[PDB]
Design a protein around this ligand. Structure first.
Ligand SMILES: *CCOCCOCCS*
Ligand SMILES: [Mg+2]
Ligand SMILES: [Mg+2]
Ligand SMILES: [Mg+2]
Ligand SMILES: [Mg+2]
Length: 313
DNA sequence: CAGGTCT
DNA sequence: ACCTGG
């Protein structure tokens, strides 16, 4: 009872609810969908992971988001701790309002979105997000999850153990910048991406001003933050857009990939007009992202998340 | 060859 | 131009 991953039924005294409709947040569409790679459904409908340097288990009913924290004497999450969950899910951003806007300007969105409510963006840490998305180059969601887990196990601080899972926090820049990290990361199957992690951890810390430079790209404009991220090894345009959208408070960023081409073409009959080339290219990908920004508005990347979730079936 | 990044 | 999965 007192050992292991908790469930709402098994230890009801250690949970606290946050008012949050299922239409504002679907955990099963947000937490496993390749935004974060570090949440696990360890019991049915119960998602466990590291959030604000502690381990949480989250589950929901129709009107409540139920939360528990593993810290020495076990107790409910305090008020300040629940705000970190609200902050992580960005719950002040009302989806009801966004879905209404997107629907009003896009009848295709109106048609598809009703089935896929509660899709929102997590407000991720920029370090974690950066190095996760560096591991996603030439890769799929299954292997990426594994690489990130091993990376965190090897180089991240031990938090606590629940059942047979030892939770680790995401590694610091210092740990990823350290001697022989590439070789160690290669032993963990990351391949050529091992170099990129090491090099980008070193470039941030030793060439760019460290953690502070990255964190202050939150305050900088989208265009600035994107340009700044591209100088890092393993970070091209797509990767930078993902980081901008997921970790640097740029809701207008629209990461363009072949998947977005398929949507644009099949669902909006989109073709590049200004650009010369017909297919994907840096010129045409920039044009596509702009199309959806003008269509959807300042939260275009959140809209994309909904269509991405809907296409996934 | 597909679909990203580096210079 | 360069890289690695399917
Ligand atoms: C698509 C070319 O990949 C860029 C990675 O370069 C090797 C350093 S990790
Ligand atoms: Mg991430
Ligand atoms: Mg290193
Ligand atoms: Mg780069
Ligand atoms: Mg908008």
């Amino acid at each position: 009872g007192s050992e292991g991953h908790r469930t709402l039924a098994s230890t009801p005294a250690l949970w606290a609810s946050i008012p949050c409709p299922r239409s504002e947040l679907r955990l099963d569409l947000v937490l496993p969908s390749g935004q974060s790679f570090r949440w696990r459904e360890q019991s049915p409908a119960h998602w466990s992971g590291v959030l604000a340097d502690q381990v949480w288990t989250l589950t929901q009913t129709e009107e409540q988001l139920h939360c528990t924290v593993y810290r020495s004497q076990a107790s409910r999450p305090t008020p300040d701790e629940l705000e970190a969950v609200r902050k992580y899910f960005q719950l002040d951003v009302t989806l009801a309002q966004l879905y209404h806007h997107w629907g009003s300007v896009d009848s295709h969105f109106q048609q598809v979105a009703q089935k896929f409510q509660g899709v929102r963006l997590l407000r991720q840490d920029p370090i974690e997000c950066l190095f996760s998305f560096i591991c996603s180059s030439n890769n799929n969601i299954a292997r990426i999850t594994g690489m990130v887990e091993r990376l965190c196990q090897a180089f991240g601080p031990r938090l606590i153990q629940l059942d047979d899972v030892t939770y680790h926090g995401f590694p610091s820049l210092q740990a990823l910048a350290g001697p022989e990290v590439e070789a160690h990361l290669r032993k963990l199957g990351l391949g050529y991406r091992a170099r990129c992690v090491s090099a980008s951890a070193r470039a941030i810390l030793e060439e760019q001003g460290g953690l502070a430079w990255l964190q202050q790209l939150r305050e900088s404009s989208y265009e600035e933050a994107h340009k700044a991220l591209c100088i890092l090894p393993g970070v091209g345009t797509k990767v930078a857009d993902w980081i901008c959208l997921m970790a640097l408070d740029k809701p207008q960023a629209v990461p363009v990939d072949v998947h977005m081409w398929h949507i644009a073409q099949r669902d909006y009959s989109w073709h590049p007009t200004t650009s010369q080339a017909k297919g994907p290219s840096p010129q045409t990908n920039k044009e596509l992202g702009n199309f959806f920004r003008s269509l959807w508005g300042p939260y275009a990347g959140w809209a994309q998340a909904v269509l991405f979730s809907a296409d996934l079936r």
